[PDB]
Design a protein around this ligand. Structure first.
Ligand SMILES: [K+]
Ligand SMILES: [K+]
Ligand SMILES: [K+]
Ligand SMILES: [Mg+2]
Ligand SMILES: [Mg+2]
Ligand SMILES: [Mg+2]
Ligand SMILES: [Mg+2]
Ligand SMILES: [Mg+2]
Ligand SMILES: [Mg+2]
Ligand SMILES: [Mg+2]
Ligand SMILES: [Mg+2]
Ligand SMILES: [Mg+2]
Ligand SMILES: [Mg+2]
Ligand SMILES: [Mg+2]
Ligand SMILES: [Mg+2]
Ligand SMILES: [Mg+2]
Ligand SMILES: [Mg+2]
Ligand SMILES: [Mg+2]
Ligand SMILES: [Mg+2]
Ligand SMILES: [Mg+2]
Ligand SMILES: [Mg+2]
Ligand SMILES: [Mg+2]
Ligand SMILES: [Mg+2]
Ligand SMILES: [Mg+2]
Lengths: 63, 107, 50, 153
RNA sequence: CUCUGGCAUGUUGGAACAAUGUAGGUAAGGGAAGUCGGCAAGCCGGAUCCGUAACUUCGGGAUAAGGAUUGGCUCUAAGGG
RNA sequence: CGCCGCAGGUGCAGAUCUUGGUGGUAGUAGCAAAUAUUCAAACGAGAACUUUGAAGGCCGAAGUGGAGAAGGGUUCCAUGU
């Protein structure tokens, strides 16, 4: 339903911003059940939460 | 039949002409939705996210002049809804729009 | 602020405990004549004296 | 409760009522005048058409600054609008009236809105802030609505 | 202009594209004839190489004024540990 | 409450009168400073505004980022309405 808490906790656990937190849009119910940082860690291990990669800023043009 | 699917090309350039810069892409998806309701006669029109990307591919003001879409009229026999039929419009990538007709596409 | 004296903190403590709704059973008391806590204070509308 | 204009006989009649409803009195009064005397099936479509902006309500008394529309010609008028919130509130009350009609065991296909009335409800106060440190009222104008439906065919 | 980080356009949206406005542009030919008054706008503008007057408290004036060049690509010399 | 006496803080249209209430104005002025939103899905009676995903943008490190002092005082955090 609402996952504002989960995205905040995933950001803290992954040590990234909320930009890079990816919550599986299909498995919303399982993520909604996670109310603890331990539960978020299990979801990160299970692939339901993913740290998205850094947006590419190439220096090939500058080089 | 009523579960027919057809492939069209829409002159976005014609339907967007005159719209301001910050409204061309949002208006392009309204004309695409209006186009689908006309040919498929279904108020419920779902636009695929990949088609939404294609319209917004070149930013908000430089919308592609032409887009090749595919209108699929399908049954809504999945839940209690006022409309038993809905149209799903998807994106058909093409290399050229020359000599492209409206063609009936099979299953 | 974060740096506060004990008196200021104790003063804020009392103002916090007394900013609560009246208990429901109060209206059942004979000759109550009280509807709601008229001394409710919100932190944003009205500021404390200090 | 006390309605104004009791029905000619309260055996072929059903009543519905609402108090302190958050709809503009002026818009609701015009919408009520349009559906007054309508058959209940006609009023239900008409109110749905107002929501879809296929039919309008003519603004006859509270018409200051109200624009002109082509659909106002069905009525002998020039000014009309499409009060969506007024249409919904009257649609809910019509459903309640029809449910009351079914409870009294009188058929709902012959109901006609013989009485409908919109009254001022006590205003509710909010605030607006003006140019030179001034506060002005920002009142709401709720309304009481009542209606009586009778059988005729 | 972009990455990390952040946000949803600043207390509403939809449809049109009339006048008048607010903000921003362009305009042939003329060039301040406008106006109390060049108000407003416009011109100029960076860097390199030249070249700079009256006057002066000799310090300045001075970026005075005025003129030329400026892209891309392929090189060639010189400047070190 | 009438009648005989007695006694007044004893009669309102005004005082830009006092207090309270209510109109026309009027469904009007208005909800226009800082570029911008769109698609799909979920929950839900109900979605332009909530959440998730996707896309397009903005702040562009002198930030619309990360933390403090003063001031505020529970606004912090969960759940629910
Ligand atoms: K109109
Ligand atoms: K218009
Ligand atoms: K002049
Ligand atoms: Mg304050
Ligand atoms: Mg007027
Ligand atoms: Mg104001
Ligand atoms: Mg002020
Ligand atoms: Mg804007
Ligand atoms: Mg907005
Ligand atoms: Mg604000
Ligand atoms: Mg000219
Ligand atoms: Mg000229
Ligand atoms: Mg002159
Ligand atoms: Mg003159
Ligand atoms: Mg000037
Ligand atoms: Mg000089
Ligand atoms: Mg050259
Ligand atoms: Mg007196
Ligand atoms: Mg008086
Ligand atoms: Mg208006
Ligand atoms: Mg406005
Ligand atoms: Mg930028
Ligand atoms: Mg900060
Ligand atoms: Mg909070």
């Amino acid at each position: 339903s609402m996952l504002r808490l989960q995205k905040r906790l995933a950001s803290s656990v992954l040590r990234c911003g909320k930009k890079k937190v990816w919550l599986d849009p299909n498995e919303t119910n399982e993520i909604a059940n996670a109310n603890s940082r331990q539960q978020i860690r299990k979801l990160i291990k299970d692939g339901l939460i993913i740290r998205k990669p850094v947006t590419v800023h190439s220096r090939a043009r500058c080089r | 039949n009523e579960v027919v699917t057809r492939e069209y090309t829409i002159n976005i350039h014609k339907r967007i002409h005159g719209v301001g810069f910050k409204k061309r892409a949002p208006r392009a998806l309204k004309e695409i939705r209006k186009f689908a309701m006309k040919e498929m006669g279904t108020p419920d029109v779902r636009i695929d996210t990949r088609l939404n990307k294609a319209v917004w591919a070149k930013g908000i003001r430089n919308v592609p002049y032409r887009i090749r879409v595919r209108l699929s009229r399908k049954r809504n026999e999945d839940e209690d809804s006022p409309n038993k039929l809905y149209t799903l419009v998807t994106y058909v990538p093409v290399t050229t729009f020359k000599n492209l007709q409206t063609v009936n596409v099979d299953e | 602020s974060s740096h506060k004296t004990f008196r200021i903190k104790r003063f804020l403590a009392k103002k916090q405990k007394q900013n609560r709704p009246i208990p429901q059973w109060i209206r059942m008391k004979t000759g109550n004549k009280i509807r709601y806590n008229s001394k409710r204070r919100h932190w944003r509308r009205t500021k404390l004296g200090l | 409760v006390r309605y104004s204009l009791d029905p000619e006989n309260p055996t072929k009649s059903c009543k519905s009522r609402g108090s302190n409803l958050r709809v503009h009195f002026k818009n609701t009064r015009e919408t009520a005048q349009a559906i007054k005397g309508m058959h209940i099936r006609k009023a239900t479509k008409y109110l749905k058409d107002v929501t879809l902006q296929k039919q309008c309500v003519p603004f006859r008394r509270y018409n200051g600054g109200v624009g002109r529309c082509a659909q106002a010609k069905q009525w002998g008028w020039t000014q009309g609008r499409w009060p969506k919130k007024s249409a919904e509130f009257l649609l809910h009350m019509l459903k309640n009236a029809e449910s009351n009609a079914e409870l009294k065991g009188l058929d709902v296909d012959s109901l006609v809105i013989e009485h409908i009335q919109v009254n001022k409800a006590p205003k509710m106060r909010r605030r607006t802030y003006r140019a030179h440190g001034r506060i002005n009222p920002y009142m709401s104008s709720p309304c009481h609505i009542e209606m009586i439906l009778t059988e005729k065919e």
